[PDB]
Symmetry: D2
Subunit: 255 residues, 4 copies
Amino acid sequence: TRYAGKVVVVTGGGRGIGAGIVRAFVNSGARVVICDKDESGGRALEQELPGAVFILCDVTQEDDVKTLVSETIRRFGRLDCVVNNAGHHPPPQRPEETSAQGFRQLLELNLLGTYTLTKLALPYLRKSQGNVINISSLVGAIGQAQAVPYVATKGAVTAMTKALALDESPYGVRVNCISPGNIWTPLWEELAALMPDPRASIREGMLAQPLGRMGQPAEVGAAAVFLASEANFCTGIELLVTGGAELGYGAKASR
Amino acid sequence: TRYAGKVVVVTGGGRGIGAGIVRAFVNSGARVVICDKDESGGRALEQELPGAVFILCDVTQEDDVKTLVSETIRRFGRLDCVVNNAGHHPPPQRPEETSAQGFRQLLELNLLGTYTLTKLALPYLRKSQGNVINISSLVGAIGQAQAVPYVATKGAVTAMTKALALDESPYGVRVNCISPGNIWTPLWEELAALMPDPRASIREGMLAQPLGRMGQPAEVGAAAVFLASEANFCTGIELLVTGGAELGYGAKASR
Amino acid sequence: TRYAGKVVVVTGGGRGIGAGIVRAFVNSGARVVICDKDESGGRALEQELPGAVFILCDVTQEDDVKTLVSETIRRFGRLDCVVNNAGHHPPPQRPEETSAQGFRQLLELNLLGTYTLTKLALPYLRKSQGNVINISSLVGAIGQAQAVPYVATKGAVTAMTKALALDESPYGVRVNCISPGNIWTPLWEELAALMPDPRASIREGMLAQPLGRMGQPAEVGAAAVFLASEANFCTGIELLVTGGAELGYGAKASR
Amino acid sequence: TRYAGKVVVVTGGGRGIGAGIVRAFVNSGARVVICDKDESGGRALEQELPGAVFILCDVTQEDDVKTLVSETIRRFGRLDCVVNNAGHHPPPQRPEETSAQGFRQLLELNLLGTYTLTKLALPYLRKSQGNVINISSLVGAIGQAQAVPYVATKGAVTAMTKALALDESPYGVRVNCISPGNIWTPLWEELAALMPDPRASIREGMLAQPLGRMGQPAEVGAAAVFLASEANFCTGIELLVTGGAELGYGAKASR
Ligand SMILES: NC(=O)c1ccc[n+]([C@@H]2O[C@H](COP(=O)([O-])OP(=O)(O)OC[C@H]3O[C@@H](n4cnc5c(N)ncnc54)[C@H](O)[C@@H]3O)[C@@H](O)[C@H]2O)c1
Ligand SMILES: NC(=O)c1ccc[n+]([C@@H]2O[C@H](COP(=O)([O-])OP(=O)(O)OC[C@H]3O[C@@H](n4cnc5c(N)ncnc54)[C@H](O)[C@@H]3O)[C@@H](O)[C@H]2O)c1
Ligand SMILES: NC(=O)c1ccc[n+]([C@@H]2O[C@H](COP(=O)([O-])OP(=O)(O)OC[C@H]3O[C@@H](n4cnc5c(N)ncnc54)[C@H](O)[C@@H]3O)[C@@H](O)[C@H]2O)c1
Ligand SMILES: NC(=O)c1ccc[n+]([C@@H]2O[C@H](COP(=O)([O-])OP(=O)(O)OC[C@H]3O[C@@H](n4cnc5c(N)ncnc54)[C@H](O)[C@@H]3O)[C@@H](O)[C@H]2O)c1
Ligand SMILES: O=C(c1ccc(F)c(O)c1)c1cccc(-c2ccc(O)c(O)c2)n1
Ligand SMILES: O=C(c1ccc(F)c(O)c1)c1cccc(-c2ccc(O)c(O)c2)n1
Ligand SMILES: O=C(c1ccc(F)c(O)c1)c1cccc(-c2ccc(O)c(O)c2)n1
Ligand SMILES: O=C(c1ccc(F)c(O)c1)c1cccc(-c2ccc(O)c(O)c2)n1
Ligand code: NA
Ligand code: NA
Ligand code: NA
Ligand code: NA
C-alpha cells in the first residue's frame, strides 16, 4: 500500500540488486517495468510477479531507451519513479592495465545510460511530481583498489545526482542516490570465481564491514522504496547502504 | 504493522520534531514512551495516542534517565529503539557574546543527555538487537553563523554516532543519526519572534532550501521509522533531511 | 628553493589557474613544461619565465600527450609532478538542453585527458617518487545548477584521484586533487559576458563566498606547490580552495 | 622567510605534534610562544630554538589562558596565529566502561580549551588579520573503536572550526583545522605500551595507512605553516594528514 497506484521503471532489474528493488516496489503496491538487456532473469520475474512486466532494453542504446519510456506510458498511463541500477564492475585491473577505450565503454553503461533514461523520463516525472533514484557506490566516495574506471564512473553518478536535484527542485521532482557497499549478488559471485582464492576473497568481502556480513538486494530495495514514497524533504542525498565499511581504521597496506 | 510489537523511547517528544517522531512510530504499530521535561505537550499526546505514554524526565539529570529506562522495562517488558531528540538551539550569538558556562550547559543537553540515555539503554538493546537514532543537524556538517556552541554540540553527536556504531556492531545493535535542516517547529517559531523582522527571517529560512520550503516533523518521523524498521545494513550513517540546503552556491556574504 | 631540481608538467598552463600554477612552481625553483592547445598565452609565458618552456599539446589527442611526455624526458631527464588542470566549463544549460554527445566531448577533456597524461607519466613518476595533482572543483562535491555534464566530470576526477592514490601508494607515488571554487580567470570573464547582466553575475559570484571575493590563480598555485613539495603524508585528499562557499545556509531558491 | 615578522602561539607545544609545529614555524621565520602544562619539554625547546619562548599554561584554566595572551602581547607586540594542539587520547575504553565525568573532563581539554584561547585571542587576530588553526583528528570524521568520548570531542572541534570561520570571515580572520591520522608521538608510544602486545599494536597502526607508515610531527607542522602563510582563500577547511587511511576497503570485523 505504501506506493500503490504508482509506476516504476528499474534498469538492470533482471537479477541482483535490480531484482531486489523490483520485488520491493511490487510489495509496496506499485506496478514495475523491468528493464534489462538479458532476457532470462527478467522474463521469469515477470511470470513470477503480478504487476511487473519485462521490456528488453539496452540502456546504452538511445533508441532502446526511447522505446522503453514510450511503451511504459502507452501501457500504464503515467511514470512516477526511475531507478537507474544497470551497471557493471570489471575484473580488478592495475592502472597500467586499463585502457581509454575500456574506460569510455564503462562510462557509456554506468553514467551515460543513467543520463539518457533520466532525460527522456523527466517530462513525465514532472507531470506526476515523481522522483529519480540512482544506484551509485560507496567506492565513488572513498575509492577502491584496482578499479580506476569503475570508481570514476560512480563519482560522476553521485555528483550528477546533486546537480540534477538542483535543476529539478523548482518542479518538485526529487533526485537522490543510494551508495551500496559489498552486496552479495551474481556479479559478486562471478568476480570472486576469477580470484586466485575465491573462498578467501568472499571471506575478506564479508569482514570489510563492521557488521561482519555482506548486504542483500532486499536491503537496497527497502532504501529505494523509502526514497520514492516517504522522503519528500530529501533531494540530492547519498544514502549509504554499506554495513559501516567506511567507519574506523582497518588494514590497508600489505607490507 | 511495520514496527509492531516493538517498544520505542523518544526524548523531547512533547512537541516539534520529537512529537512527529512519536506519531510516526505509533502509526507503525509500536508502543512509545514519550520523554520530556515539560508536562503540557507530552501529557496531551498520551491522552491522544493509544500506545503512547508520557514519563516526565529531564535528560540532563542522570537519576531521571535511570528511572525512565527502568519504568519502560517494568511497564512494557523490552526496549527496541531509543530516539535521542531532546535538544535546544540558543538565540543567535556572536562568538564574543558566548560564554564557557553557556557552552557547558548546552553540551549537557545536546550531547551528554544523548550519551547517558544511550548508555543505560544498551543492555536492553543488546537483548532485542535494537538500535539507536540520534537527532543531530546539518549545521554540524556545514557550520552555521552565530552558533558556535550549538554547531559544536551537533558535530559531536554525529561523530559519536559513528564511534558507537563501531563498538556495538559485534552485538548487532545499529547506531545511526538524522541530520535535519530547517524544520518548522515551535523552536523555529520562537527564535523567529526574537528577530528584528520575524516575517523576513521566516521567508529567508524557507528560501535556504532549493525545494523552497521548510521541512515538517512528520518527514523526520518517516526517516526515523525507516532507520528503525528497514535499514538492517545501515549503521553509523548520517541521513540528511534538509530539502537540499547543502547543495550548490548561494549568497553567503552581505558586503 | 622549495622544489629546486624538480620537473613539472602543467596542462592548460597558458592562462587562468594553469598559468598561476606555472608561476608558483617556477618561483619555487622548479623547471616547468607548459602544455596548452592554444599557442598565444603559453608562448608568451615561456618568453617571460626562465625555467618554463611551452609544448603545444591537446590533451584529448593521445599522440599529443605521448609526445609531451617523451619531449619532457628528452629535454629535462626526469619528471616529478603532473598537474592536470586543462578543462572547460560550458555555458549554463538546462538538463533538457544538454546532449549525450556534448557530455561525451566534455568527458574527453575534463576526465579522459587527465587519465591519459597520468597513465603515460606514471613510469617516470615511480622512478622519481613523484606525485599527481588533479584540478577538480567544489561543485563535484556539492553540485551546481545548469551544469549536469560539468559537475559529473568533476565528481569523476575527485573519485579517480582516490582510486589511483590507492593503486600507487605501494610505489610511493602520491595522488591528490585541488577543488577550487569561484576563481577569477578568463573563463569566468567569458562566461559572465554571455549572461543577461554581466555585472550582476560577477557581483553574485563574489558574494557566494563568506570571504566576499573570488579566488586568484596564485592561491591555487600555492596549494599545488604545497601538495608537491611538503605534503609527504597526504595522498588521495581533496584540498578545498573555495573561500568557504560550502559553509552555512544561503539563499538557494528564488520563489 | 615565509612567515617572518609574525607571532604564533602553539598549545601543547612541548612534545609530539605540538613540538613539530613549533619547529616548523620557527624555521619559517616566526617568533613562537610555546604553551604547555608540563615544563620539561617546553623549557628545553626554548633553550634550543632562538625565537621560541616557553610560557607555562594549562589551557583548561581560564586565568592561565588570559595570562598567556597578555604575556604574548606584552613581550612581542602582536599576535598572528593560534594553533590549538593541546589534547589527549585516553586508553581504549568500551562504551560501558566510560563515564559522564570522564567525558566532561575530556571535553574541557580537547574542546573548551580550544574555545577559550581562541576567544581571548580574536581581538588581536582581528587587528593583524591573523588566523586560527585547530588540530582535530580523522576519527572525528570516520569514528574510532573504543573511543566514544575522544571521537565526540574531535567531531565538535571540526564543526566548531566551520562555525567560527563563518563568524570571523567579515573581519578577514580565517579559521581552519588539520585532521591528522596515526602520527608517531610520545602519546602513541605510551598508549601502545599499555596494549597486550605493544609491537603488534604498532605494526597494525603502521598498516592502517596505504602508505604503510605512520606520519611524523614535522608533516603536521608543514601543513600548519601552509594554512597560516599561503592559504589566503582557505577558511573553514579540514586538511587531512592521514597517509590515506580513510580510502578504500579494509578488514573492520574480526569474526
Ligand atoms: N554488488 C555490489 O556489491 C555493488 C556495490 C555497490 C554498487 N553496486 C551497483 O549496483 C548495480 C547492480 O549491481 P549488481 O551487483 O546487482 O550486478 P549484477 O551483474 O548482478 O546485475 C546487473 C544487471 O544489469 C543488467 N545490465 C547490464 N548492462 C545492462 C545494459 N546495458 N542495459 C540494461 N541492463 C543491463 C545485467 O544484465 C544484470 O541483470 C550496479 O550499478 C553496480 O555498480 C553493486
Ligand atoms: N527545528 C529545526 O530546524 C532543527 C534542525 C535540525 C536539528 N534540530 C534538532 O531537533 C531536535 C528537536 O528540535 P525542535 O525544533 O523540535 O525543538 P522544540 O524546542 O520545538 O522541542 C524540543 C522538545 O524537547 C524538550 N526538551 C528540552 N530540553 C529537555 C530536557 N533536558 N529533557 C527532556 N526534554 C527536553 C522540550 O521540552 C521540547 O518538547 C533538537 O535536537 C534540535 O537541535 C532542529
Ligand atoms: N574558474 C573557476 O572558478 C574554476 C573553479 C573550479 C575549477 N576550475 C577548473 O580549473 C581549471 C582551469 O580553469 P580556468 O578558469 O583557468 O579556465 P581557462 O579557460 O581560463 O583556462 C584553461 C586553459 O586550458 C587550455 N585548454 C583547454 N582545452 C585544452 C586541451 N584540450 N588541451 C590542452 N589545454 C587545453 C585553454 O587553452 C586555457 O589556456 C579547469 O579544469 C576548471 O574546470 C575552475
Ligand atoms: N598522535 C596521533 O596519532 C594523533 C592523531 C590525530 C590527532 N592527534 C591530536 O594531536 C594533538 C597532539 O597529540 P600528540 O600525539 O602530540 O600528544 P602528546 O601527548 O604526545 O603531546 C600533547 C602535549 O600537550 C600537552 N598538554 C596536555 N594537556 C594540556 C593542557 N591542559 N594544557 C596545555 N598543554 C597540555 C602535553 O603536556 C604534551 O606536551 C592532540 O590534540 C591529539 O588529539 C593526535
Ligand atoms: O562489484 C564489486 C563491488 C564491490 C564493492 C562495491 F562498493 C562496488 O560498487 C562493487 C566487486 C565484487 C567482487 C569483488 C570486487 C573487487 C575485489 C577486489 C578488487 O581489487 C576490486 O577492484 C573489486 N568488487
Ligand atoms: O533552531 C534552529 C535551527 C535551524 C537550522 C538547523 F539546522 C538547526 O539545527 C537548528 C533555528 C531556528 C530559527 C532560526 C535559527 C537561526 C537563525 C539565524 C542564526 O544566525 C542562527 O544561528 C540560527 N535557527
Ligand atoms: O567556470 C565556472 C565555474 C564556477 C565555479 C566552479 F566551482 C567551477 O568549477 C567552475 C563559472 C564561471 C562563470 C559562471 C559560472 C556559472 C554561472 C551560473 C551557472 O548556472 C553555472 O552553471 C555556471 N561558472
Ligand atoms: O592517540 C591515538 C590516536 C590515533 C589515531 C587518531 F586519529 C587519533 O586522533 C589519536 C592512539 C595512539 C595509540 C593507540 C590508539 C588506539 C588504539 C586502539 C583503540 O581501540 C583506540 O581507541 C585507540 N590511539
Ligand atoms: Na507479471
Ligand atoms: Na495513550
Ligand atoms: Na623560458
Ligand atoms: Na629561545
